[PDB]
RNA sequence: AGGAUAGUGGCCUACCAUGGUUUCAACGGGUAACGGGGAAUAAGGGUUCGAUUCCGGAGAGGGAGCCUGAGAAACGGCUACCACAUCCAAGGAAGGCAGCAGGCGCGCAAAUUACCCAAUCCUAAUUCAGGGAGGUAGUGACAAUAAAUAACGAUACAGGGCCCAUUCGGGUCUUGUAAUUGGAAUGAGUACAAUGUAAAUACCUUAACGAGGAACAAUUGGAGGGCAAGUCUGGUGCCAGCAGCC
């Protein structure tokens, strides 16, 4: 038989189920970033934990351990490449500090609202979803996307669809058809 | 004959592919399940094989109740 | 003895009451918008402490 | 000195004494002796079909008073005869004689839920259909 | 043909198969993907070997429209194509005609029936003729 | 010492000797035991598993035997016994799915009697032929990834920042409640075509059709404690039932 596909779980569920402290702190993050599930939160805190997992494990190695420097750069190279690590904080173990919020900020869904463009984070999500708004030649509709900050000024409404010229939209299209039917002929 | 249908049939039926085709007439026949007897298994462990069997026998014939 | 006799007793006795047609509750992201709003800004149900059910 | 040896060469006595003393652990002992095979009305499986021999009523333990409404089942794989609680209001009326039922355990690893003496199983399906789905008039017992 | 702009990346000459191989990369805004017989001549003129001798396949159109990506070949001649080319795609191009056959299961049955005859099989064709029914 | 083997060897035979293993656990019993790479849970240490994508090994109903051949103690080879079992004109003949589908049985427990060598590779006298290996599709809430079920105005209201203030507020930012209405966005479907593929199917591209809420309508568990969330109303009255535990 041919080889197995590998697959992995992206998320991890909390241990105490009914601590209101976590229940409320979660819901604040939902309305703020326009999320639906706690899975959306859990995925990110699991990512963040899968990341401190590597981070504390490198500070235990003494400075100038070729592995420490090599993946220490590799990490932060990937973390201000997205804007979830600020440019100054490129220093080594500022990483251990991040909360989840820095990721939800760098989500595609949030930028489309924090770049004007949406008027509400809930409006942002459905704008992404419905084949509007794109980066270059590429049309993107995954609210959790991690804009790379090489792109937060390279994203306008897509070349297709209204809000972007280049064709008129389809609800006004039927609405304006009978604009020339109850007008006599 | 059709295979793989039996498990959905008690004794008879109509097969259609219309959304609203009706059933089919009920085959008025002449004899009737009138002479009865009583059964149970010689060995008690066998009752499950008997209750299953009685459903299986009732498919065998068009008349046995 | 002491038969079943009365199995469905209360369920068979509890008078039927009907559900009512309601405003449909939104599903998905839009619902946690409601929990956000209905718990953080224009929640027209608070009562001094933070309480989630009135016996008016 | 704390009861056990410490020497770098006392691995044998250390390992062999855990082996000895693991036996006072019920969960270990039930596994190694395989009493879910030798004992245990189900084969050590989670469920079991069965032919309902008769309805049956059991008075609860005190302080409570009520009739709990069990059935008596002969397990198809086993012959073994057991009793099983039938959940929820009424709902005994869904059980006829000698229609197959699927029984589950009682969420208690043997033992028994509070009221009911000597009952370690619950009906889950009867005549092939889910019990709850009959309680809620959402599914029908199969046609005669 | 809305600004069809039929690009062609990663090319190299292959005498061992008597053809030149390359990937195609077509843009087509407002133009919802572009056909193959269509694509075959829009470059059959580019290196104008015969139109009946240029071959292309692959072609997953990209997301949000406006692109597609294939893989193509140009043969030195038509006859060097038919010969070296996959027999199955010569017929979409049209230069070959499909071969009707018998169903794979049905020809397998005949194989196993002929395992039961040893000779020509026309020896027993006559022994049955005489008898039955005497 | 010979015999035998492809060849070492108590592998076997003749002769001789009395040796060989064991509490540092032999021998025996059990395994719901094929080993391993590995899987689950993991502060660290550990605990539990591994029939199952690779590797090694064993088997082809149970045993033995054997022909062929470089290679088999072969099972889609033969011979015999044992168990099961088919056909028949009763003289006789033939059998091996732990291969692919499919069925019985068994059970809590597991899919199509479908298409094809196009890819992956394999074989042969062989570029060509064969390949239920393998690939495709069917079935599939085993597990895993992403993530629609609405967005946004206005009407009125409860109001909530507010520049003037002898001012009921003379401007207001904001927030939502009530069928109060409004035009925008859209894929789920469906569907030109192309694309896809060996030929199709779905996907991706996309012509036309596809949203007002009575629909394009999300469920599953629960609201005494553990434990997030009612001292609401009606019903029943140690009955029915709930209740992991209290
Ligand atoms: Mg579009
Ligand atoms: Mg002990
Ligand atoms: Mg013991
Ligand atoms: Mg003791
Ligand atoms: Mg059942
Ligand atoms: Mg020798
Ligand atoms: Mg075994
Ligand atoms: Mg093992
Ligand atoms: Mg396990
Ligand atoms: Mg294994
Ligand atoms: Mg096994
Ligand atoms: Mg398999
Ligand atoms: Mg193997
Ligand atoms: Mg073998
Ligand atoms: Mg067998
Ligand atoms: Mg053999
Ligand atoms: Mg073989
Ligand atoms: Mg075979
Ligand atoms: Mg299953
Ligand atoms: Mg089955
Ligand atoms: Mg092939
Ligand atoms: Mg071939
Ligand atoms: Mg498949
Ligand atoms: Mg799933
Ligand atoms: Mg309840
Ligand atoms: Mg509470």
PDB file of C-alpha atoms (C1' of nucleotides) in Angstrom, chain C residues 6-7 9-10 13 15 21 24 26-30 33 37 41-42 51-53, chain F residues 149-152 158 175-176 214-215 217-218 229-231 235-237 239-241:
ATOM      1  CA  UNK C   6     -48.406   3.160  35.812  1.00  0.00           C
ATOM      2  CA  UNK C   7     -45.453   3.675  33.490  1.00  0.00           C
ATOM      3  CA  UNK C   9     -47.905   8.227  34.498  1.00  0.00           C
ATOM      4  CA  UNK C  10     -46.641  11.785  34.749  1.00  0.00           C
ATOM      5  CA  UNK C  13     -50.511  13.271  32.575  1.00  0.00           C
ATOM      6  CA  UNK C  15     -50.747  18.615  30.027  1.00  0.00           C
ATOM      7  CA  UNK C  21     -42.951  30.655  16.715  1.00  0.00           C
ATOM      8  CA  UNK C  24     -35.023  32.977  14.616  1.00  0.00           C
ATOM      9  CA  UNK C  26     -28.742  33.659  14.422  1.00  0.00           C
ATOM     10  CA  UNK C  27     -26.114  30.981  13.990  1.00  0.00           C
ATOM     11  CA  UNK C  28     -22.353  31.139  13.773  1.00  0.00           C
ATOM     12  CA  UNK C  29     -20.176  34.215  14.192  1.00  0.00           C
ATOM     13  CA  UNK C  30     -23.272  36.412  14.297  1.00  0.00           C
ATOM     14  CA  UNK C  33     -21.729  39.061  18.232  1.00  0.00           C
ATOM     15  CA  UNK C  37     -23.412  42.931  22.615  1.00  0.00           C
ATOM     16  CA  UNK C  41     -22.810  47.394  25.759  1.00  0.00           C
ATOM     17  CA  UNK C  42     -26.602  47.599  25.204  1.00  0.00           C
ATOM     18  CA  UNK C  51     -27.338  38.238  36.703  1.00  0.00           C
ATOM     19  CA  UNK C  52     -28.455  36.174  33.721  1.00  0.00           C
ATOM     20  CA  UNK C  53     -32.135  35.425  34.543  1.00  0.00           C
TER      21      UNK C  53
ATOM     22  C1'   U F 149     -26.153  29.857   8.285  1.00  0.00           C
ATOM     23  C1'   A F 150     -25.788  36.733   7.478  1.00  0.00           C
ATOM     24  C1'   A F 151     -23.802  42.109   6.299  1.00  0.00           C
ATOM     25  C1'   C F 152     -24.993  47.174   6.219  1.00  0.00           C
ATOM     26  C1'   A F 158     -35.190  53.654  25.325  1.00  0.00           C
ATOM     27  C1'   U F 175     -25.502  52.475  21.639  1.00  0.00           C
ATOM     28  C1'   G F 176     -29.364  49.101  20.972  1.00  0.00           C
ATOM     29  C1'   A F 214     -43.531  31.942   7.648  1.00  0.00           C
ATOM     30  C1'   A F 215     -37.107  31.333   4.978  1.00  0.00           C
ATOM     31  C1'   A F 217     -34.881  28.001   9.600  1.00  0.00           C
ATOM     32  C1'   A F 218     -28.243  23.886  13.687  1.00  0.00           C
ATOM     33  C1'   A F 229     -26.309  28.993  33.722  1.00  0.00           C
ATOM     34  C1'   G F 230     -33.710  30.307  37.097  1.00  0.00           C
ATOM     35  C1'   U F 231     -35.324  30.893  44.288  1.00  0.00           C
ATOM     36  C1'   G F 235     -48.246  19.340  35.847  1.00  0.00           C
ATOM     37  C1'   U F 236     -47.241  14.941  39.476  1.00  0.00           C
ATOM     38  C1'   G F 237     -47.405  14.254  45.189  1.00  0.00           C
ATOM     39  C1'   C F 239     -46.111   7.802  42.473  1.00  0.00           C
ATOM     40  C1'   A F 240     -43.882   8.701  37.788  1.00  0.00           C
ATOM     41  C1'   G F 241     -39.191   9.510  37.059  1.00  0.00           C
TER      42        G F 241
END
